[model samples]
Target: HMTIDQWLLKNAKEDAIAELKKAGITSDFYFNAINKAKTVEEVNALKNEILKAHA
Candidate 1:
């Protein structure tokens, strides 16, 4: 997580929420966290959150 963020930085931070949301990953609490993710690490965490949401 941190490693990916360190590698991609801001570039990794962009557009994932919309993409993931479009992919049927919709949960208010979860997407709200995605909205707050500012880096790939945060995005990764957000993805994990979504995974848990579905699981």
Candidate 2:
């Protein structure tokens, strides 16, 4: 996964991961990759992908 900031990395913790899972986001890598996105459309696509993967 790509490197992200410390604050973002903090979201990879147990509680945060639990929260994301509740929202149907199962991948920590997803969070990391999100910061690498250069466009809103790309971020939206990642959101869609996360939802789709969970579904």
Candidate 3:
């Protein structure tokens, strides 16, 4: 299975962006953070925050 860090490091900048957008999370901070993310925990943590806020 592919991991979040793997995808991000493997050039998934737009992948995470679109996913966040589709999730109704239109935040520049989140997108930028994702692009600048250095680890799986950060992305996953941000994703959890997004879900909680949007859900």
Most lDDT-accurate candidate: 3
lDDT values, one for every candidate: 0.64, 0.57, 0.72
Candidate 1 has an lDDT of 0.64
Task: Give, for candidate 2, the lowest lDDT window spanning 10 residues.
Answer: 7-16
Better of 1 and 3 by TM-score: 3
Clashes of each: 0, 0, 0
Candidate 1 per-residue lDDT, tens place, 1-55, comes to 5566465754543466566666787657666676566667778876766766665
Over the stretch 1-55, how does candidate 3's per-residue lDDT look in tens digits?
A: 8787676564555666777898898879888877776665666676667767887
The CA lDDT at 20 in model 2 is: 51
RMSD values for the candidates in order, in angstroms, are 5.5, 6.8, 4.7
| All candidates: TM-score | 0.45, 0.51, 0.57
**Distance from true position, residue 21, model 2, in Å?**
5.7
Candidate 3 lDDT score at position 33: 79
CA shift of 27, model 1, Å = 2.7
